[PDB]
Design a protein around this ligand. Structure first.
Ligand SMILES: [Cl-]
Ligand SMILES: [Cl-]
Ligand SMILES: [Mg+2]
Ligand SMILES: [Mg+2]
Length: 339
């Protein structure tokens, strides 16, 4: 497949996981039969699913990139804040709303300060930075620029390293997925090398310690994903206890990556009619918790990896704004990748 199929697939896959996963957000347990019914209802017998904050912020990030043809912290912060002001009921978390209201003050002449000040100066470690980050890996082909701008774009709302590191992980995952076919072992080793480095910085260690976490939450979960991929059967309870299904970035980003790697292979519980990308989204949603956001992040990776040949027209056409999403993906490819 061509890179353009991957760009289009990446943003469609993210759009799908948000649209489809929104119905189940903050549900502790999800019935898999309910999820199969929900997705099957997208291919009925001869209204759109609305997207949430994940997509709204992913759109803004992409649009900022395209408008300035580069990362531009001021532009992007203003587009996040204005998108919120215009449509605040898309399902934003309460934490990030506080940052938007501050970014909205005309005295605000440092757009990183609201995020940096949050939680008594420790910053948010939620996955709102990672939920939106995929486009950075479509704008920036080098791994050094992916980590740099994933970090920066995250820090506009999520200043804890526990937050921005999740964003970097997610973007790296997307980056690597664009290189296409990989063993799950090679994909992880690559991610691991970057995170073990990043989690050694002082701020990373200090932020973990402060949370009492015996540290390297990302590296230790990447190591666990490999362990889980080698096990005959792994239950949802096991995934949830080991990796997580929560709003904290370290409880969702590794989990997203697991859903992507695990769903390369057939699942007896998911009908054989569904392809790898569809299985990925079904399975991620089926874990419960932060279903929209885990599924949007698994969807970005899967979409980049498998490309449009696995994005079902029936499902894509069910999502709000799919044609606009597709135009922005084409535009990213034209502007950043072509030359
Ligand atoms: Cl294409
Ligand atoms: Cl540091
Ligand atoms: Mg959402
Ligand atoms: Mg969510």
């Amino acid at each position: 497949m061509r890179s353009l199929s991957r760009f289009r697939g990446c943003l469609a896959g993210a759009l799908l996981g948000d649209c489809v996963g929104s119905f189940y957000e903050a549900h502790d347990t999800v019935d898999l039969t309910s999820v199969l019914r929900h997705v099957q209802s997208l291919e009925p017998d001869p209204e759109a699913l609305y997207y949430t904050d994940d997509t709204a912020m992913a759109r803004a990030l992409v649009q900022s990139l395209l408008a300035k043809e580069a990362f531009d912290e001021v532009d992007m912060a203003h587009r996040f804040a204005q998108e919120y002001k215009k449509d605040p009921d898309r399902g934003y978390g309460a934490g990030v709303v506080t940052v938007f209201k501050k970014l909205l003050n005309p005295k605000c002449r440092d757009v990183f300060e609201p995020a940096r000040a949050q939680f008594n100066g420790k910053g948010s470690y939620g996955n709102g930075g990672a939920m939106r980050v995929a486009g950075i890996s479509l704008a920036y082909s080098s791994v050094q620029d992916v980590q740099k701008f994933a970090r920066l774009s995250a820090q506009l709302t999520h200043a804890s390293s526990l937050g921005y590191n999740g964003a970097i992980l997610q973007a790296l995952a997307v980056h690597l997925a664009l290189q296409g076919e990989s063993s799950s072992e090679h994909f992880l080793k690559q991610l691991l090398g970057h995170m073990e480095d990043l989690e050694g910085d002082a701020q990373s260690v200090l932020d973990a310690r402060e949370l009492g976490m015996e540290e390297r939450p990302y590296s230790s979960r990447l190591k666990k994903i490999g362990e889980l991929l080698d096990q005959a059967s792994v239950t949802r309870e096991e995934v949830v206890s080991e990796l997580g299904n929560g709003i904290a970035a370290f409880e969702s980003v590794p989990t997203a990556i697991y859903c992507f790697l695990r769903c390369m292979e057939p699942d007896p519980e998911i009908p054989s009619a569904f392809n790898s990308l569809q299985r990925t989204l079904i399975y991620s949603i089926s874990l419960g918790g932060d279903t929209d956001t885990i599924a949007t992040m698994a969807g970005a990776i899967a979409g980049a990896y498998y490309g449009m040949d696995q994005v079902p027209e029936s499902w894509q056409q069910s999502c709000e704004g799919y044609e606009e999403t597709d135009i922005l993906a084409q535009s990213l490819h034209r502007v950043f990748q072509k030359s």
